[PDB]
């Protein structure tokens, strides 16, 4: 009898001051807010029902109305920022944190869910949820000897909410909150549920998306080997955040990059650099570009793992945004690599796909490619072999393209393209 009420009828029941009439109107509101087709969230808000729902959260003597109002508020909070703000403005944050201690599992789970929606709105509400003290009772729900004893959906909701507490930048989450959460994240990262694993990886990817000090907090917990293992998962929803975290880590110091290499990550990149999902190839190639921007011994590990032919492959054929990352990987490679490493790069056939990408109507990748050509010529000068490279570039049509770039509009494109020809093709 609570199906398809009007908002007016819901208001009538909630204003009735009959607890059972209030409970049924609240359930009717929950069912209204649970429909896929355009749930009347704004009409419920404008009816002034949020403070009433929040008040119902505190009725410990009537657990069903706590549950129904928590569910109704969860779905309002899952909407726009203005709709989430209406829930927060109703005082729902401390009420939901109090419900985390509920003896009813389905009620505390709803409070977990609601706080995840609120924290997921942005850094402001995230930090406000933290200031209200949500982390201690949330982590206390996971303080069991074995996570497998917890209900699966319950554990998935807790992991997701914890990930939203790790989410967003400007500012990043408070340092002490991250330290408080991380040991539980590491444990969730070893759980055997695919959705817990995915959301745990997402949380780690958020925490590593920052300066080296943030990356270091994660790396010192020793999770890089587990991240590398999850890099090899068959589930794309796990590989994607695991790869984002690995890529974030290698934006840090050479020592942090080395932890990724030491853990065996490069052995997965033959598959990642040919992955059918465009986003995986792009992320994997971007990651490779930050590894080839490392030390010469790290460039050498890329060589030993047979990854240069795979970089030649993505440069030859990939989505353009992936080919752009491949161009960066080559320019970084030639900028920091030894003469012998650069020679090997030419031997793998980098020149022709490099030249072909000078056709691209992207002024930055042209600058990137021209830089790599200069770097390769500089290594050819140290060998006295610039003539042979000049022949290679012309034979594949590269010099025709470089000379067309002399009439290019953007400045450093045509300055650099004349310097190449003036010096090596003249």
């Amino acid at each position: 009898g609570t199906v398809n009420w009007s908002v007016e009828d819901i208001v009538k029941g909630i204003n009735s001051n009959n607890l059972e009439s209030q409970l049924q109107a609240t359930q009717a509101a929950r069912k209204l807010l649970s429909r896929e087709k355009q749930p009347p969230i704004d009409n419920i808000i404008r009816a002034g029902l949020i403070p009433k729902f929040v008040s119902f959260l505190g009725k410990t003597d009537c657990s069903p109305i706590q549950f129904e109002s928590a569910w109704a508020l969860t779905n309002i909070a899952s909407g726009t920022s203005e709709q989430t703000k209406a829930v927060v403005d109703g005082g729902a944050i401390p009420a939901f944190i109090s419900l985390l201690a509920s003896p009813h599992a389905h009620i505390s789970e709803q409070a977990v869910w609601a706080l995840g929606n609120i924290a997921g709105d942005g850094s402001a509400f995230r930090d406000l949820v933290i200031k209200h003290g949500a982390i201690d009772p949330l982590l206390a729900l996971l303080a069991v000897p074995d996570l497998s004893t917890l209900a699966c959906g319950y554990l998935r909701n807790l992991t997701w909410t914890l990930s939203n507490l790790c989410r967003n930048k400007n500012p990043a989450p408070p340092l002490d909150a991250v330290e408080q959460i991380l040991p539980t994240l590491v444990r969730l990262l070893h759980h055997n549920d695919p959705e817990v694993l995915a959301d745990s990886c997402w949380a780690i990817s958020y925490l590593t998306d920052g300066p080296n000090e943030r990356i270091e907090m994660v790396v010192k917990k020793g999770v890089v080997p587990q991240l590398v293992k999850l890099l090899g998962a068959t589930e794309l929803p796990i590989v994607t955040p695991a790869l984002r975290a690995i890529g974030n880590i290698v934006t840090g110091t050479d020592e942090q990059t080395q932890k990724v290499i030491d853990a065996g990550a490069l052995a997965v990149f033959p598959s990642l650099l040919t992955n059918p999902k465009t986003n995986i190839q792009k992320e994997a190639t971007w990651t490779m570009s930050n590894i080839t921007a490392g030390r010469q011994d790290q460039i050498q590990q890329v060589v030993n793992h047979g990854l240069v032919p795979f970089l030649v492959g993505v440069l030859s054929k990939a989505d353009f945004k992936t080919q752009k990352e491949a161009a960066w990987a080559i320019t970084n490679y030639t900028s920091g690599g030894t003469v012998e490493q650069i020679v090997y790069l030419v031997h793998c056939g980098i020149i022709e796909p490099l030249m072909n990408l000078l056709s691209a109507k992207d002024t930055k990748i042209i600058q990137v490619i021209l830089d790599a050509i200069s770097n390769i010529f500089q290594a050819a000068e140290k060998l006295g072999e610039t003539e042979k490279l000049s022949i290679m570039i012309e034979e594949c049509g590269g010099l025709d393209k470089i000379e067309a770039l002399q009439r290019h509009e953007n400045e450093s494109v045509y300055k650099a393209s004349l310097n190449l020809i003036e010096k090596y093709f003249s």
Binding site: G247, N248, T251, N290, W328
Partner: peptide, 8 residues
């Protein structure tokens, strides 16, 4: 050098 990830 290293290139951190774009916000997009």
């Amino acid at each position: 050098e290293k290139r951190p990830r774009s916000p997009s």
